Structure 1
Amino acid sequence: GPKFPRVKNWELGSITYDTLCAQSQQDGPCTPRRCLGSLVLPRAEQLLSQARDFINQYYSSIKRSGSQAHEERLQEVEAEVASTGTYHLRESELVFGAKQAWRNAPRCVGRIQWGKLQVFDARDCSSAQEMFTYICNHIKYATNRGNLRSAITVFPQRAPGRGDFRIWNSQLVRYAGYRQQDGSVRGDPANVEITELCIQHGWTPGNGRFDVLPLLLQAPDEAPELFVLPPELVLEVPLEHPTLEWFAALGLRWYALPAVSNMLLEIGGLEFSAAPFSGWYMSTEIGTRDLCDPHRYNILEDVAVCMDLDTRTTSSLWKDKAAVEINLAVLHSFQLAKVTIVDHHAATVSFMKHLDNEQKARGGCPADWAWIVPPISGSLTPVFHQEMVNYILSPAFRYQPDPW
C-alpha cells in the first residue's frame, strides 16, 4: 500500500520502501516513456532555496532543527546573498556537506565508510603552487605508507566573474599514454589527451607503460601550471601472482591511491570546482577494468597465452579464466605490499550492510545498480539480487566537462 517505490531483495525475499527519494530536488534522465539508467552521462532565488535547504540539513544532523541558532544562520545566509550574490560555509558545515556528498553518491560501493572522511579545508588557497602543496599534503596523509585513509581537499568555490580553481587531471595519480608511430598506444589509452596536454605545457615525457603523469593545476584566470609529483610520494604496487611464477615477469604495476580530481562538489548551491577526493581501491577496478578493458591496457590475451589457454574460441572461457587470475594477482600483490585494498565480495557485502543502515537512518539509499554490481562475478555478489532506486540528492559530486 505505501505510496513510495517498493524495493525487493530477490535472494532473501525481503522488502523495503524508499521514502528518501521524495527529498530529491533534481531530475535524472528517465521518463515514464523510456529508461536511460545505463547512460554514463546524463546532460538569485535559486541559490537561496538551495542554501536554505542545505542549512536545514545541517541543523537536522546536529538535532537543532527549529532553534534560534538555526534561524539566525538562515538569516545570516540570506543577508549574505542579499548583498554579495553568494555566501560562505562555516567550517563544520563544509565537513558535513562533503560527507553528505559522498553518502549521496549513487555510483559508489564504498559508502559504508562515509562517516570517516578527513576533510582538509583549503578555501584559503590562492595560487597554483599552493594548490600543489595542498595536493602533496593530501597524498601523503591519504597514502599513510599504505594504510590508506579516505580524504578530500576543498579549494575555493566558484565566484561570480572570477575564473575557477581547476585540476586538469581526472585523477591525482594516473599513467601516461603515448600515441605511437603505428597508431597504437604505449601506456594507458585513456590518458592520451592529458598526456599530450602535459607535453604541450612543457613536460619531458617518458617512454614507459607506467609513467606517472604530472599535475596540471589552474588557479583563477591563469593558464594552468605544471607540477611533477616527487616519486617518493606516489606509492606503487608491483604485480605478482601467488602461484603463477611467470606473472611477475610481465612487469605489471598499479598505484595505491585512487583519487578523483575532476569532479564538482556542490553544497547548498555553492560550487567547488576543485575538490579532489580519495579512498582505497576495490580490486576489480584495477584487475578487471584498468588492466582488461579492450580500450585500456588490454592484457587478457597476453595473460591467457601465458596460461596456455585456447584463445581461438570463445567457449574455452579463456577470457573469464585469465581475468580471474589477474584479479587474484591484484589482491595478493596489494596484500603482500601491505596496501589497503578490498575484493569485490567484501565490498559488496559491506554495501548491503550500508543499505540496511541507511534504510533505518534515512528511509532509503540512492544507488546505480549498473555501477554497484562489479564487472566480474556479478551474480556471485549479494548486490546483484538487490533492487535499487537511483535519484540525485544534494550535497552531490558532479561530473564536469574537461576545462580545455
Structure 2
Amino acid sequence: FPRVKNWEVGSITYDTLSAQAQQDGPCTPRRCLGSLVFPAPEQLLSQARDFINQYYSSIKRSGSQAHEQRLQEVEAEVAATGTYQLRESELVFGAKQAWRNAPRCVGRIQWGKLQVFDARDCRSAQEMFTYICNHIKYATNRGNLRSAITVFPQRCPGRGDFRIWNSQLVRYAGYRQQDGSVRGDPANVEITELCIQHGWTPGNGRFDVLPLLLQAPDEPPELFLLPPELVLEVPLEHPTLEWFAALGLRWYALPAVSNMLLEIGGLEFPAAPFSGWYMSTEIGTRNLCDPHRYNILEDVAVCMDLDTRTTSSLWKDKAAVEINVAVLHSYQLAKVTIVDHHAATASFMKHLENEQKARGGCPADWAWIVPPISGSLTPVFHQEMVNYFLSPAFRYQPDPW
C-alpha cells in the first residue's frame, strides 16, 4: 500500500485502492514509463462478475439476492449468446465509474453528475447522426454546459463496430498547403483529408468546422454536416488589449471527445462520445500555443511589443498568460461555461480527499493533472499521486481506417 505525501501540507495518506488495479500499465521496477502518452466467454464472464458485484456493493445490496438473480442471469445470457446486455441502470453506473476512474481527468469532482443517453438501439448512420445532434444540443444548453455521454451499440462478434471517425464532435479543419504548412489545425490534417476524400467540399478558413464522418457496422462512413446553429463558438477578445480581437481567433464551446472506447464489465463500446466543459489552459495554452497546433505565441508577443530575440525577457510566458486571460474573459463574456486551472485543480484536491474516504484512494496521473502553465502555483503540483487502471474505463483505440 503506497504511502502518499502532500509536500505543501506534510499530510499523509495510503492508497489501498491501487491493490485492486485491473490491468497492467507500462512501468516495471527497472524503468518508469509514466510519461508515455500511450501505455472467450471465461474472460468475458470474469469481467462481467466483477462489474456486477461492483454495482451491487455501490447500492448497498451485496449478499442480497437481487444480486444473485442478476449474477446468474448474465451467466445464462452469455452462455446463450456470446455476449450480454447491460441494464440501463448498470450502463449509467458504468459510464460514471469509467469517468471517475480516468487517471488523467482533473474534472472528476463532477463524476456523479453525468447525463447518459442510451443509443444502444441505434441501427443506422443517420440515427447515429441524430443521436449526436441531440447530445450536442443537450450538453451545450445555450452556454450553460452540462456533462453528457451517448452510448451506441456494443461491439459484438461477426459484426462491424459503430465508430465516430472524428476525434471530437467539433474539430477545425487542417488544410495542408504545398509549402508543407497547415492552414487551420495541424492536429486535424488526417481527418480533413478523409472528409474531403469522402466528398466534403473544403473551406479555407483558419476555423472551418469539419463535417462528421460516422460509420455504421460493416458499412463505409458517411459525411454529415453539423447545423451551424448547433455549434456554439466563442470569438476571442482580450479585456484590455484591443488589438487582440483582430487576430480573428475563436474556439468552440463543447469539448466532446468521440474516439475513445468505453469498457464496462467486459463489454466494449467503440463509439461513446462524452463531453464536459473546458479548462481554459486546454484552449489558451495547448491548442493555441503548442508549436504543432495553432502556434500563435510569437504572433501575440509581437503584438504585445515584447522583446522576442532573447528568452530571459520571458516573452513566451507573458504572452501565454495573456492568451489565457483572453480565453477566460471571452468565455465569461459569452456566458459559456469554463474553468481556470487554479479553480479546477483546487476542486481536484477536494476530489482526492472525497475519494480517499469513499474508496481509499484515487488513480491519478501527475503529468496530466498538473496544468501546462503555472504548474507549481497549483496545489496538485505538491501532491504525490498513484497511477493505475481500474475498470470500467475509457481506453484509447486504434483508428477505424
Common topology (TM > 0.5) = yes
Q: Distance between the aligned counterparts of 1:159 and 1:190, measured in 2?
A: 31
Q: Distance between the aligned counterparts of 1:123 and 1:69, measured in 2?
A: 24
Q: Between the two proteins, what is the percent identity of the paired residues?
A: 95
Q: Distance between the aligned counterparts of 2:81 and 2:117, measured in 1?
A: 26
- Deviation per residue, 1:36-67 (Å, 9 max, x gap): 00000019211001000000011011100011
2:162 alignment partner in structure 1? 165
Structure 2: where are the runs of 5+ without partners?
Answer: none
Q: Distance between the aligned counterparts of 1:228 and 1:66, measured in 2?
A: 50
- Deviation per residue, 1:288-326 (Å, 9 max, x gap): 000000000000000000000111111110100000000
Q: Distance between the aligned counterparts of 1:23 and 1:264, measured in 2?
A: 22
Q: Distance between the aligned counterparts of 1:11 and 1:214, measured in 2?
A: 47
Quick one: which of 261, 285, 288 aligns to 1:288?
285
- Deviation per residue, 1:110-136 (Å, 9 max, x gap): 000000000000000000000000000
Q: Which moved more, 1:23-32 or 1:282-291?
A: 23-32
Q: Distance between the aligned counterparts of 1:158 and 1:43, measured in 2?
A: 14
Deviation at residue 181 of structure 1 after TM alignment = 2.3
Change (3 A) 1:261 1:331: same
Q: Distance between the aligned counterparts of 2:179 and 2:77, measured in 1?
A: 58
Q: Distance between the aligned counterparts of 1:401 and 1:360, measured in 2?
A: 36
1:383 alignment partner in structure 2? 380
1:80 alignment partner in structure 2? 77
Q: Distance between the aligned counterparts of 1:382 and 1:100, measured in 2?
A: 25
2:201 alignment partner in structure 1? 204
Q: Distance between the aligned counterparts of 2:130 and 2:257, measured in 1?
A: 17
Q: Which moved more, 1:36-45 or 1:152-161?
A: 36-45
- Deviation per residue, 1:123-176 (Å, 9 max, x gap): 000000000000000000000000000000000000111000000000000100
1:31 alignment partner in structure 2? 28
Q: Distance between the aligned counterparts of 1:311 and 1:238, measured in 2?
A: 27
- 1:155 equivalent to 2:152? Answer yes
Change (3 A) 1:43 1:200: farther
Q: Distance between the aligned counterparts of 1:37 and 1:281, measured in 2?
A: 24
1:21 alignment partner in structure 2? 18
Q: Distance between the aligned counterparts of 1:172 and 1:401, measured in 2?
A: 18
- 1:228 equivalent to 2:225? Answer yes
- Deviation per residue, 1:342-365 (Å, 9 max, x gap): 000000000000000000000000
- 1:115 equivalent to 2:91? Answer no
Q: Distance between the aligned counterparts of 2:194 and 2:9, measured in 1?
A: 51
The TM-score, its normalising length taken from structure 1, stands at 0.99
Q: Distance between the aligned counterparts of 1:43 and 1:17, measured in 2?
A: 36
Q: Which moved more, 1:36-45 or 1:349-358?
A: 36-45
1:260 alignment partner in structure 2? 257
Q: Distance between the aligned counterparts of 2:359 and 2:40, measured in 1?
A: 28
Q: Distance between the aligned counterparts of 2:186 and 2:143, measured in 1?
A: 27
- Deviation per residue, 1:90-109 (Å, 9 max, x gap): 00000000000000000000
Deviation at residue 402 of structure 1 after TM alignment = 1.1
**SS of equivalent to 1:106:** coil
Q: Distance between the aligned counterparts of 1:73 and 1:302, measured in 2?
A: 60
Q: Distance between the aligned counterparts of 2:181 and 2:230, measured in 1?
A: 30
- Deviation per residue, 1:197-243 (Å, 9 max, x gap): 00000001100000001100000000001100010000000000001
Deviation at residue 252 of structure 1 after TM alignment = 0.4
Deviation at residue 82 of structure 1 after TM alignment = 1.0
Q: Distance between the aligned counterparts of 1:242 and 1:148, measured in 2?
A: 23
Deviation at residue 22 of structure 1 after TM alignment = 1.2
Q: How many residues end up aligned between the 2 structures?
A: 401
The TM-score, its normalising length taken from structure 2, stands at 0.99
- Deviation per residue, 1:251-302 (Å, 9 max, x gap): 1000000000000000000000000000000000000000000000000000
Q: Distance between the aligned counterparts of 1:214 and 1:226, measured in 2?
A: 6
Structure 1: where are the runs of 5+ without partners?
Answer: none
**SS of equivalent to 1:237:** strand
Q: Distance between the aligned counterparts of 1:279 and 1:187, measured in 2?
A: 24
Map 1:5-404 → 2, pairs under 5 A: 5-42=2-39, 44-404=41-401
Change (3 A) 1:43 1:146: farther
Q: Distance between the aligned counterparts of 2:93 and 2:46, measured in 1?
A: 18
Q: Distance between the aligned counterparts of 1:233 and 1:253, measured in 2?
A: 16
